[PDB]
């Protein structure tokens, strides 16, 4: 039972566990891997996840969600003031630490945002535990890259309230890069652009990865751009339509609008795989059955500026990172809203047709990375490296035929693998343009008595007297015994290779 990582968002969250080289992303009670960052305080119990989201229209005044905007902030913080004007619940200046007042079991208790998010984390904890069949406290929680230190501590504390051992707080874009394997090494010295288009926010972050070591070069964003306003444009389409079609002003009924919005969310998600989606609500407003539709093209028109504006922070991030388009090697998507074809088309066209990394569901990639990181942090073994080195060795020395018909070993018998070993060779005779390397396995001095594994030619060698050209021959062996023998001439940079397949007295006298 491995450590887990939790993707703690403003509108949604997701938990995964890392094991057997992969992260298993875990479904909630209804089969949903990603569930809402909502807690509904009712007079009987607090519902968490889909259960809270499903009743926002009925109990919005007591349902608390998007705790993150308030977490780690002071009551007087302009952000706090900006968001409290948008909530159905009351935000309270309890010592400049904004609390939310909702009725729980009949009492108008003020709940601090860290406990609201711990309620969410506790639910995510329970989801992963039910799946894994084991209680789990070892965890990584992700946060936006822009979070400051009061916010990071606040996130750790929400974890502690929930009973978690917070191994670490890591950034959302780091986790995505991890999820896509950009930290597996051999992919170093690359720039990664992460496009984080979520529910209530949009962020862009440019990372540089050097063989597993990360640096963040730049960030940019729009703190109010995300799926929620794509939903609001779809809502205005349907709300104004309803009113005009029926001469009934639905916009004034918070529940009817929320039912319409829920349909907007469903239709929009459907629309992203489709070309068309519909709205079908019985008795939506004043007993009126509202049946209508949205096409993909209409959706894009409604939201045409919301989509185009996502590239403005892209240009900003590139400016801050001092990078041109050509300097981004890896294009990465984060957030369910990037599943809309228009987003993919805009980012991909912006970067001249280059393919986006869509290999992991955008809403799972962050949790995925957190889970991988949680597993290494709980104890630093992650399908490597010491077992590979101690269990698998080169069973026979590995080397090459050299002049004289003899074998020169570069990898010694029973040496641990994976490993890379080298030696310097020159052409045997004078003024040759290249060399012939015969790769062998075995313990005999002569090559005629060894196992020929394969042969290759190293070209690009300036002719010079014997012993002058400097050729480095490398025996590069992986964990499974596969051998790659390469060679290069250090004076020209030219190289070639062969792939070898796997087997698996006087002093006592006087005068």
């Amino acid at each position: 039972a491995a450590a887990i990582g939790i993707d703690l968002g403003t509108t949604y969250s997701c938990v995964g566990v890392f094991q057997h080289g992969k992260v298993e992303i875990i479904a909630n009670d209804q089969g949903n891997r990603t569930t809402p960052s909502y807690v509904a305080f009712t007079d009987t119990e607090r519902l968490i996840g889909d259960a809270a989201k499903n009743q926002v229209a009925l109990n919005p005044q007591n349902t608390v969600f998007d705790a993150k905007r308030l977490i780690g902030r002071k009551f007087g913080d302009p952000v706090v003031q900006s968001d409290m004007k948008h909530w159905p619940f009351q935000v309270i200046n309890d010592g400049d630490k904004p609390k939310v007042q909702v009725s729980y079991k009949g009492e108008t208790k003020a709940f601090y945002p860290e406990e609201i998010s711990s309620m969410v984390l506790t639910k995510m904890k329970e989801i992963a535990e039910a799946y894994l069949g084991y209680p789990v406290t070892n965890a990584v929680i992700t946060v936006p890259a822009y979070f400051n230190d009061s916010q990071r501590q606040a996130t750790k504390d929400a974890g502690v309230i929930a009973g978690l051992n917070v191994l670490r707080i890591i950034n959302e874009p780091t986790a995505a890069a991890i999820a896509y394997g950009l930290d597996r090494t051999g992919k170093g010295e690359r720039n990664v652009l992460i496009f984080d288009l979520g529910g209530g926010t949009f962020d862009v972050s440019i990372l540089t990865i050097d063989d597993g070591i990360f640096e963040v070069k730049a960030t940019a964003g729009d703190t109010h751009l995300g799926g929620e306003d794509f939903d609001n444009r779809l809502v205005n389409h349907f709300v104004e339509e309803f009113k005009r079609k029926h001469k009934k002003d639905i916009s004034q009924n918070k529940r009817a609008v929320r039912r319409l919005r829920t349909a907007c969310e469903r239709a929009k998600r459907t629309l992203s795989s489709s070309t068309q989606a519909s709205l079908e609500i019985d008795s939506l407003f004043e007993g009126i059955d509202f049946y209508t539709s949205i096409t993909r093209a209409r959706f894009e028109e409604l939201c045409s500026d919301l989509f185009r504006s996502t590239l403005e922070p892209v240009e900003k991030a590139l400016r801050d990172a001092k990078l041109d388009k050509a300097q981004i090697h890896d294009l990465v998507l984060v957030g369910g809203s990037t599943r809309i074809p228009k987003v993919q088309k805009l980012l991909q066209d912006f970067f001249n047709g280059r393919d986006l990394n869509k290999s992991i569901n955008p809403d799972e990639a962050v949790a995925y990375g957190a889970a991988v990181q949680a597993a290494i942090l709980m104890g630093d073994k992650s399908e490597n490296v010491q077992d590979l080195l101690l269990l698998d060795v080169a069973p026979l020395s590995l080397g090459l035929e050299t002049a004289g018909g003899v074998m020169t070993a570069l990898i010694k018998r029973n040496s641990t693998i994976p490993t890379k070993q080298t030696q310097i060779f020159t052409t045997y005779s004078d003024n040759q343009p290249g060399v012939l390397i015969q790769v062998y396995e075995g313990e005999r001095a002569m090559t005629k008595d060894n196992n020929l594994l394969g042969r290759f030619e190293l070209s690009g060698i300036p002719p010079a007297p014997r012993g002058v050209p400097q050729i480095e021959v490398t025996f590069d062996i992986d964990a499974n015994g596969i051998l790659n023998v390469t060679a290069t001439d250090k004076s020209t940079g030219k190289a070639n290779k062969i792939t070898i397949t796997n087997d698996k007295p006087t002093i006592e006298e006087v005068d």
């Binding site: 052409t427 045997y428 060399v435 390397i437 015969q438 190293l458 070209s459 014997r466 021959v473």
Partner: protein, 259 residues
């Protein structure tokens, strides 16, 4: 293209020898200075004092922790202490070369009696002779002498203190403890340790009486053109900065013993 080979068969492994190679020969002795005159030391003492205070700066910096003092204070201390360091330096050489009867401006220059008693010499030099006489009467060892020269270095400060004074104070107290040790391990017995210590310390304290008069000569000849006295750039800067503070009582004399 030809089969490769481990050529030339001349690839050395000198690694164990490279580990062995470490030593080099290092040398002592870094600079040198002398006066070029005798009765005219009335002006050449300043050229010498310039070179000696500069040497005193190099010397002072060589003492661990001195370079960590604020530069403004490092220079303030040589600006005020150069005079006692000079008289004391003459003192040691005089003590050993002329039985403290003559001042020894450099290892290669001793000014004899026929010049020593001339007013252009003696009005300043009689105070420097006091110092030589005391090292001789006191029978000061070279270790004890160096401890005292080192103490004089930090002995004259502004009445308002030093910018980085706390480090100066730690250094100066380390030095007085060193003088005590130099004496205790040489005289033997107990009564002779305190008598040699306090008698040598009294010279360090009386060096300020020597400095008051030696500086007044320099201050007077620096400002009064009637005297026809030339100064090097080093002392000229020190003296213009030192006169308005020393003659007005704005500089504190630090003593290591009471009367």
């Amino acid at each position: 293209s030809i089969v490769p080979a481990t050529l030339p068969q001349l690839t050395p492994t000198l690694v164990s020898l490279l580990e062995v190679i470490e030593p080099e020969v290092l040398y002592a002795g870094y600079d040198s200075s002398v006066p070029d005159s005798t009765w005219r030391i009335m002006t050449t003492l300043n050229m010498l004092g310039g070179r000696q205070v500069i040497a005193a700066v190099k010397w002072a910096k060589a003492i661990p922790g001195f370079r960590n003092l604020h530069l403004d204070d490092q220079m303030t201390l040589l600006q005020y202490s150069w005079m006692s360091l000079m008289a004391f330096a003459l003192g040691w050489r005089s003590y050993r070369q002329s039985s403290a009867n003559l001042l020894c401006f450099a290892p290669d220059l001793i000014i004899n009696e026929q010049r020593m008693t001339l007013p252009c010499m003696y009005d300043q030099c009689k105070h420097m002779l006091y110092v030589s006489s005391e090292l001789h009467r006191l029978q000061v060892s070279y270790e004890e002498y160096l401890c005292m020269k080192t103490l004089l270095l930090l002995s004259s400060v502004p009445k308002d203190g030093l910018k980085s004074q706390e480090l100066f104070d730690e250094i100066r107290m380390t030095y007085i403890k060193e003088l005590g040790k130099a004496i205790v391990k040489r005289e033997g017995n107990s009564s002779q340790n305190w008598q040699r210590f306090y008698q040598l310390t009294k010279l360090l304290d009386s060096m300020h009486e020597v400095v008051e008069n030696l500086l007044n000569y320099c201050f007077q000849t620096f400002l009064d053109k009637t005297m026809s006295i030339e100064f090097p750039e080093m002392l000229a800067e020190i003296i213009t900065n030192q006169i308005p503070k020393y003659s007005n009582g704005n500089i504190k004399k630090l003593l290591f013993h009471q009367k």
